[PDB]
RNA sequence: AGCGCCGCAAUUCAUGCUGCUUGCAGCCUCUGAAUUUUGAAAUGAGGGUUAGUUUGACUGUAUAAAUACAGUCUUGCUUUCUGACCCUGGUAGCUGCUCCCUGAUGCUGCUGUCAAUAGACAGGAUAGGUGCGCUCCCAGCAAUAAGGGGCGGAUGUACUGCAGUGGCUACUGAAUCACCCCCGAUCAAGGGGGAACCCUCCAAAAGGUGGGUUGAAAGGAGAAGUCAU
DNA sequence: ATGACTTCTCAACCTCCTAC
DNA sequence: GTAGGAGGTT
């Protein structure tokens, strides 16, 4: 639900970058391409066309002969792990797309393929003599890498180092299931210029981080969920490898109860009856209402001009840019609408926290096309009362001047920002032919009625 | 003139205002919602220029909670706007076509000085518009196997025109800056000096010691297909 | 060939081989 | 002999 990627840049002298480029681009990327092709020619793919699922063992079984091949001989085992993880994720995504929508598919790109680290223990964080946080992976451990990141992400790497030190200083009595780092990706940003490829492309890292583990009080929720899941797994499981796995899990239960020296923050105890609802239209991208769901009195309405206070110019800039790109496309992305959606999501979450709202509701994407069409028809009727030609011309001009808002990105941003504090995301039926504040209030009451029925 | 945007005034009000009657009454000082009008405040600028400031993390005190204060550490990632800065270009190579009239469509439009003019030299984004941009109009322009008229070269129904049009690449020039300069580093590291303002001490004053200011925001990433034209 | 949608994913303990 | 690095394995 809540998993935040953390950016960093790995910096070292020339020999390290040269070794990484000569070991990944020359070996690892062709290795991944070979796995892709060889599973493409696998006879079971047609069988995998019948049902959209993949065994977790066949990929490793196919990759095992290539490990001993002289072409792909020199590489750490964790990098083979990375290659098979990448091919498994890619083919699982392909199978999921094929199943939902119900053949060579090699990626065409100049940059080398990412290195994925599913095991968080692979990277070893160590403070440098100067004060930086050198990091090295499982394998190629003597090629260190200083991390560069902003002050807004330095605490994540500091807690990576702190968690590793607490694990090492406790004689491995702590568990890695509570580590705030889960997954890692090593790529290049394709720095523009001229020179050697290893000395030209900036090497960067993405660290998948679970925010629910940030606070000591929040770690308890993750601990309880993991304990319940693994207890269900072990009670369903009840064979040498199976016995080894069950003993590992039963040791993980004992290991997960150890205390971590983490900051403690009060959990967001939002009132279950104070709903906050978001309504999306075309004349105004979003309006917010706060209701009590017990006494039908609205605590606060909020227009988009208040959520974007001191930033409302950016909405007009986004609309102008969208019109310009539409005109250019008709004649033959600035990544600003995403920023606007994130601003709106943060403003709505801050509003809900300030008014002590325990649940945020926002409409589904399925009804959005009908909502846009109804809004266009309603505004055309409001402008031109009765004659069809006037409403049609006004609707055409209005749609040409201003386009839709790409609401799904806003939905994702709201969900991601609400998962940070712990506000329940809910859906509701968008009402038709009403004021945006009236629409938001009716959506909130409909959501409360649906929750009452459930 | 149609449409879209800012806020100027007015009206109805609250998501606002005080006392509570804590749910009803009045009001528009502030913050905002809906409608009409409107060209004195705002939106609005052609191409780029940063290891760019802040929006950070932790520990305590107060608000029972938003939040503020005090202390410690600090880092440079993907962005987003404002402000400031240089130019509206110079070289070489490769490469599509071809005319008189009539188009759809599309491009250009700043200021000053010589030349009627093409074309040169300066300034310089306040770049043709109602306050502001646009698939909208205001002018000029424009190429082609879009239509028509063909002419010469030319034996032929055969081919060319009747010096201009677009695209690509390498070397490349100015900013390589968030008060402004100097030096230095550009997979690494900053150092030095100076102007204005504010606070405190010394201090008759002038001045000197110590500190700060000289913009503000947001963050989930990887790979893939799908759809619409 | 170009902007949104979406479904996948976001491991964890254990064992063997060095070092002074 | 404990601490750290490389590899397994579902």
PDB file of C-alpha atoms in Angstrom, chain A residues 75-253:
ATOM      1  CA  UNK A  75      29.430 -12.809 -12.229  1.00  0.00           C
ATOM      2  CA  UNK A  76      28.306 -12.813  -8.580  1.00  0.00           C
ATOM      3  CA  UNK A  77      25.515 -15.204  -7.647  1.00  0.00           C
ATOM      4  CA  UNK A  78      23.365 -12.319  -6.393  1.00  0.00           C
ATOM      5  CA  UNK A  79      23.575 -10.826  -9.890  1.00  0.00           C
ATOM      6  CA  UNK A  80      22.199 -14.075 -11.326  1.00  0.00           C
ATOM      7  CA  UNK A  81      19.490 -13.682  -8.670  1.00  0.00           C
ATOM      8  CA  UNK A  82      18.907 -10.167 -10.005  1.00  0.00           C
ATOM      9  CA  UNK A  83      18.714 -11.356 -13.620  1.00  0.00           C
ATOM     10  CA  UNK A  84      16.193 -14.107 -12.888  1.00  0.00           C
ATOM     11  CA  UNK A  85      14.159 -11.709 -10.723  1.00  0.00           C
ATOM     12  CA  UNK A  86      14.051  -9.200 -13.595  1.00  0.00           C
ATOM     13  CA  UNK A  87      12.985 -11.804 -16.151  1.00  0.00           C
ATOM     14  CA  UNK A  88      10.407 -13.246 -13.728  1.00  0.00           C
ATOM     15  CA  UNK A  89       8.864  -9.824 -13.063  1.00  0.00           C
ATOM     16  CA  UNK A  90       8.802  -8.978 -16.778  1.00  0.00           C
ATOM     17  CA  UNK A  91       7.165 -12.256 -17.800  1.00  0.00           C
ATOM     18  CA  UNK A  92       4.723 -12.115 -14.871  1.00  0.00           C
ATOM     19  CA  UNK A  93       3.666  -8.637 -16.012  1.00  0.00           C
ATOM     20  CA  UNK A  94       3.255  -9.951 -19.566  1.00  0.00           C
ATOM     21  CA  UNK A  95       1.132 -12.878 -18.360  1.00  0.00           C
ATOM     22  CA  UNK A  96      -0.997 -10.574 -16.195  1.00  0.00           C
ATOM     23  CA  UNK A  97      -1.572  -8.213 -19.131  1.00  0.00           C
ATOM     24  CA  UNK A  98      -2.494 -11.144 -21.387  1.00  0.00           C
ATOM     25  CA  UNK A  99      -4.931 -12.543 -18.806  1.00  0.00           C
ATOM     26  CA  UNK A 100      -6.539  -9.148 -18.149  1.00  0.00           C
ATOM     27  CA  UNK A 101      -6.889  -8.257 -21.840  1.00  0.00           C
ATOM     28  CA  UNK A 102      -8.388 -11.673 -22.670  1.00  0.00           C
ATOM     29  CA  UNK A 103       6.125 -13.685 -29.571  1.00  0.00           C
ATOM     30  CA  UNK A 104       9.509 -12.091 -28.931  1.00  0.00           C
ATOM     31  CA  UNK A 105       9.358  -9.163 -26.508  1.00  0.00           C
ATOM     32  CA  UNK A 106      12.986  -8.123 -25.949  1.00  0.00           C
ATOM     33  CA  UNK A 107      13.533  -4.592 -24.671  1.00  0.00           C
ATOM     34  CA  UNK A 108      15.072  -2.143 -27.159  1.00  0.00           C
ATOM     35  CA  UNK A 109      17.209   0.368 -25.261  1.00  0.00           C
ATOM     36  CA  UNK A 110      20.828   1.503 -25.290  1.00  0.00           C
ATOM     37  CA  UNK A 111      21.182   1.633 -21.494  1.00  0.00           C
ATOM     38  CA  UNK A 112      22.129  -1.556 -19.615  1.00  0.00           C
ATOM     39  CA  UNK A 113      19.471  -3.411 -17.675  1.00  0.00           C
ATOM     40  CA  UNK A 114      18.770  -2.640 -13.997  1.00  0.00           C
ATOM     41  CA  UNK A 115      20.307  -4.622 -11.155  1.00  0.00           C
ATOM     42  CA  UNK A 116      17.561  -5.606  -8.698  1.00  0.00           C
ATOM     43  CA  UNK A 117      18.265  -6.519  -5.065  1.00  0.00           C
ATOM     44  CA  UNK A 118      15.242  -8.208  -3.505  1.00  0.00           C
ATOM     45  CA  UNK A 119      17.256  -9.320  -0.467  1.00  0.00           C
ATOM     46  CA  UNK A 120      17.863  -6.233   1.673  1.00  0.00           C
ATOM     47  CA  UNK A 121      20.930  -7.865   3.274  1.00  0.00           C
ATOM     48  CA  UNK A 122      22.877  -7.668  -0.008  1.00  0.00           C
ATOM     49  CA  UNK A 123      23.828  -4.005   0.441  1.00  0.00           C
ATOM     50  CA  UNK A 124      26.257  -3.307   3.298  1.00  0.00           C
ATOM     51  CA  UNK A 125      26.154   0.270   4.581  1.00  0.00           C
ATOM     52  CA  UNK A 126      29.345   1.617   6.143  1.00  0.00           C
ATOM     53  CA  UNK A 127      30.307   5.150   7.133  1.00  0.00           C
ATOM     54  CA  UNK A 128      33.293   6.640   5.325  1.00  0.00           C
ATOM     55  CA  UNK A 129      36.267   8.298   7.002  1.00  0.00           C
ATOM     56  CA  UNK A 130      35.137  11.707   5.725  1.00  0.00           C
ATOM     57  CA  UNK A 131      31.569  11.094   6.899  1.00  0.00           C
ATOM     58  CA  UNK A 132      29.785   9.707   3.853  1.00  0.00           C
ATOM     59  CA  UNK A 133      27.882   6.406   3.779  1.00  0.00           C
ATOM     60  CA  UNK A 134      29.785   3.968   1.576  1.00  0.00           C
ATOM     61  CA  UNK A 135      27.669   1.092   0.256  1.00  0.00           C
ATOM     62  CA  UNK A 136      28.696  -2.196  -1.347  1.00  0.00           C
ATOM     63  CA  UNK A 137      26.575  -5.107  -2.528  1.00  0.00           C
ATOM     64  CA  UNK A 138      26.698  -8.854  -1.904  1.00  0.00           C
ATOM     65  CA  UNK A 139      29.532  -9.640  -4.271  1.00  0.00           C
ATOM     66  CA  UNK A 140      32.056  -7.139  -5.617  1.00  0.00           C
ATOM     67  CA  UNK A 141      32.339  -5.965  -2.004  1.00  0.00           C
ATOM     68  CA  UNK A 142      35.684  -4.185  -2.504  1.00  0.00           C
ATOM     69  CA  UNK A 143      34.172  -1.684  -4.979  1.00  0.00           C
ATOM     70  CA  UNK A 144      32.766   0.884  -2.537  1.00  0.00           C
ATOM     71  CA  UNK A 145      30.283   3.621  -3.472  1.00  0.00           C
ATOM     72  CA  UNK A 146      29.702   6.934  -1.716  1.00  0.00           C
ATOM     73  CA  UNK A 147      26.030   7.925  -1.608  1.00  0.00           C
ATOM     74  CA  UNK A 148      24.824  11.378  -2.654  1.00  0.00           C
ATOM     75  CA  UNK A 149      21.287  12.481  -1.787  1.00  0.00           C
ATOM     76  CA  UNK A 150      19.449  15.492  -0.442  1.00  0.00           C
ATOM     77  CA  UNK A 151      18.700  16.273   3.182  1.00  0.00           C
ATOM     78  CA  UNK A 152      15.133  15.059   2.563  1.00  0.00           C
ATOM     79  CA  UNK A 153      16.433  11.501   1.984  1.00  0.00           C
ATOM     80  CA  UNK A 154      19.560  11.375   4.181  1.00  0.00           C
ATOM     81  CA  UNK A 155      17.668  10.013   7.198  1.00  0.00           C
ATOM     82  CA  UNK A 156      16.620   6.947   5.191  1.00  0.00           C
ATOM     83  CA  UNK A 157      20.250   5.985   4.549  1.00  0.00           C
ATOM     84  CA  UNK A 158      21.187   6.869   8.122  1.00  0.00           C
ATOM     85  CA  UNK A 159      18.536   4.422   9.353  1.00  0.00           C
ATOM     86  CA  UNK A 160      19.757   1.828   6.836  1.00  0.00           C
ATOM     87  CA  UNK A 161      23.189   2.096   8.459  1.00  0.00           C
ATOM     88  CA  UNK A 162      21.636   2.134  11.947  1.00  0.00           C
ATOM     89  CA  UNK A 163      19.534  -0.971  11.257  1.00  0.00           C
ATOM     90  CA  UNK A 164      22.548  -2.835   9.899  1.00  0.00           C
ATOM     91  CA  UNK A 165      24.610  -1.838  12.947  1.00  0.00           C
ATOM     92  CA  UNK A 166      21.852  -2.968  15.323  1.00  0.00           C
ATOM     93  CA  UNK A 167      21.601  -6.301  13.496  1.00  0.00           C
ATOM     94  CA  UNK A 168      25.374  -6.841  13.580  1.00  0.00           C
ATOM     95  CA  UNK A 169      25.770  -5.722  17.212  1.00  0.00           C
ATOM     96  CA  UNK A 170      23.036  -8.095  18.461  1.00  0.00           C
ATOM     97  CA  UNK A 171      24.775 -11.286  17.223  1.00  0.00           C
ATOM     98  CA  UNK A 172      22.189 -11.538  14.412  1.00  0.00           C
ATOM     99  CA  UNK A 173      19.342 -11.814  16.932  1.00  0.00           C
ATOM    100  CA  UNK A 174      17.308  -9.240  14.985  1.00  0.00           C
ATOM    101  CA  UNK A 175      15.158  -9.969  11.939  1.00  0.00           C
ATOM    102  CA  UNK A 176      15.337  -8.440   8.472  1.00  0.00           C
ATOM    103  CA  UNK A 177      11.546  -8.446   8.112  1.00  0.00           C
ATOM    104  CA  UNK A 178      11.387  -5.175  10.069  1.00  0.00           C
ATOM    105  CA  UNK A 179      14.158  -3.419   8.115  1.00  0.00           C
ATOM    106  CA  UNK A 180      12.903  -0.211   6.514  1.00  0.00           C
ATOM    107  CA  UNK A 181      14.649  -1.138   3.233  1.00  0.00           C
ATOM    108  CA  UNK A 182      13.007  -3.851   1.126  1.00  0.00           C
ATOM    109  CA  UNK A 183      14.072  -3.642  -2.540  1.00  0.00           C
ATOM    110  CA  UNK A 184      16.805  -1.950  -4.550  1.00  0.00           C
ATOM    111  CA  UNK A 185      17.399  -0.995  -8.175  1.00  0.00           C
ATOM    112  CA  UNK A 186      20.730   0.033  -9.719  1.00  0.00           C
ATOM    113  CA  UNK A 187      20.510   1.931 -13.022  1.00  0.00           C
ATOM    114  CA  UNK A 188      22.116   4.770 -14.976  1.00  0.00           C
ATOM    115  CA  UNK A 189      20.543   8.166 -15.660  1.00  0.00           C
ATOM    116  CA  UNK A 190      22.159   8.539 -19.131  1.00  0.00           C
ATOM    117  CA  UNK A 191      24.162  11.685 -18.504  1.00  0.00           C
ATOM    118  CA  UNK A 192      24.497  13.731 -21.680  1.00  0.00           C
ATOM    119  CA  UNK A 193      27.980  14.418 -23.003  1.00  0.00           C
ATOM    120  CA  UNK A 194      30.908  12.681 -24.669  1.00  0.00           C
ATOM    121  CA  UNK A 195      33.414  10.209 -23.279  1.00  0.00           C
ATOM    122  CA  UNK A 196      33.673   6.681 -21.968  1.00  0.00           C
ATOM    123  CA  UNK A 197      30.287   5.115 -21.105  1.00  0.00           C
ATOM    124  CA  UNK A 198      31.333   4.396 -17.512  1.00  0.00           C
ATOM    125  CA  UNK A 199      32.662   7.957 -17.098  1.00  0.00           C
ATOM    126  CA  UNK A 200      29.617   9.557 -18.782  1.00  0.00           C
ATOM    127  CA  UNK A 201      26.479   7.943 -17.327  1.00  0.00           C
ATOM    128  CA  UNK A 202      25.666   8.696 -13.696  1.00  0.00           C
ATOM    129  CA  UNK A 203      25.124   5.556 -11.611  1.00  0.00           C
ATOM    130  CA  UNK A 204      22.009   5.853  -9.440  1.00  0.00           C
ATOM    131  CA  UNK A 205      20.106   3.721  -6.939  1.00  0.00           C
ATOM    132  CA  UNK A 206      16.422   3.437  -6.036  1.00  0.00           C
ATOM    133  CA  UNK A 207      15.745   2.106  -2.529  1.00  0.00           C
ATOM    134  CA  UNK A 208      12.245   0.774  -1.887  1.00  0.00           C
ATOM    135  CA  UNK A 209      11.204   1.889   1.604  1.00  0.00           C
ATOM    136  CA  UNK A 210       8.146   0.943   3.660  1.00  0.00           C
ATOM    137  CA  UNK A 211       6.922   4.081   5.433  1.00  0.00           C
ATOM    138  CA  UNK A 212       4.896   2.089   7.982  1.00  0.00           C
ATOM    139  CA  UNK A 213       8.235   1.092   9.560  1.00  0.00           C
ATOM    140  CA  UNK A 214       9.319   4.724  10.064  1.00  0.00           C
ATOM    141  CA  UNK A 215       7.879   5.115  13.580  1.00  0.00           C
ATOM    142  CA  UNK A 216       8.291   2.660  16.450  1.00  0.00           C
ATOM    143  CA  UNK A 217       4.529   2.698  17.017  1.00  0.00           C
ATOM    144  CA  UNK A 218       3.996   2.127  13.294  1.00  0.00           C
ATOM    145  CA  UNK A 219       6.380  -0.835  13.276  1.00  0.00           C
ATOM    146  CA  UNK A 220       3.922  -2.711  15.511  1.00  0.00           C
ATOM    147  CA  UNK A 221       1.297  -2.814  12.739  1.00  0.00           C
ATOM    148  CA  UNK A 222       3.802  -4.333  10.306  1.00  0.00           C
ATOM    149  CA  UNK A 223       5.021  -6.775  12.969  1.00  0.00           C
ATOM    150  CA  UNK A 224       1.465  -7.925  13.714  1.00  0.00           C
ATOM    151  CA  UNK A 225       0.581  -8.273  10.023  1.00  0.00           C
ATOM    152  CA  UNK A 226       3.743 -10.262   9.272  1.00  0.00           C
ATOM    153  CA  UNK A 227       3.225 -12.476  12.327  1.00  0.00           C
ATOM    154  CA  UNK A 228      -0.377 -13.216  11.340  1.00  0.00           C
ATOM    155  CA  UNK A 229       0.600 -13.936   7.727  1.00  0.00           C
ATOM    156  CA  UNK A 230       3.438 -16.291   8.657  1.00  0.00           C
ATOM    157  CA  UNK A 231       1.325 -18.087  11.287  1.00  0.00           C
ATOM    158  CA  UNK A 232      -1.352 -18.622   8.632  1.00  0.00           C
ATOM    159  CA  UNK A 233       1.346 -19.882   6.254  1.00  0.00           C
ATOM    160  CA  UNK A 234       2.778 -22.353   8.775  1.00  0.00           C
ATOM    161  CA  UNK A 235      -0.643 -23.634   9.873  1.00  0.00           C
ATOM    162  CA  UNK A 236      -1.587 -24.127   6.215  1.00  0.00           C
ATOM    163  CA  UNK A 237       1.719 -25.835   5.373  1.00  0.00           C
ATOM    164  CA  UNK A 238       1.219 -28.609   7.947  1.00  0.00           C
ATOM    165  CA  UNK A 239       9.618 -32.553   2.416  1.00  0.00           C
ATOM    166  CA  UNK A 240      13.172 -31.846   3.572  1.00  0.00           C
ATOM    167  CA  UNK A 241      13.219 -28.412   1.927  1.00  0.00           C
ATOM    168  CA  UNK A 242       9.691 -27.787   3.221  1.00  0.00           C
ATOM    169  CA  UNK A 243      10.854 -28.704   6.731  1.00  0.00           C
ATOM    170  CA  UNK A 244      13.857 -26.379   6.405  1.00  0.00           C
ATOM    171  CA  UNK A 245      11.580 -23.543   5.283  1.00  0.00           C
ATOM    172  CA  UNK A 246       9.129 -24.181   8.129  1.00  0.00           C
ATOM    173  CA  UNK A 247      11.994 -24.117  10.654  1.00  0.00           C
ATOM    174  CA  UNK A 248      13.249 -20.867   9.112  1.00  0.00           C
ATOM    175  CA  UNK A 249       9.759 -19.386   9.471  1.00  0.00           C
ATOM    176  CA  UNK A 250       9.399 -20.595  13.069  1.00  0.00           C
ATOM    177  CA  UNK A 251      12.752 -18.952  13.825  1.00  0.00           C
ATOM    178  CA  UNK A 252      11.516 -15.789  12.089  1.00  0.00           C
ATOM    179  CA  UNK A 253       8.574 -15.663  14.508  1.00  0.00           C
TER     180      UNK A 253
END
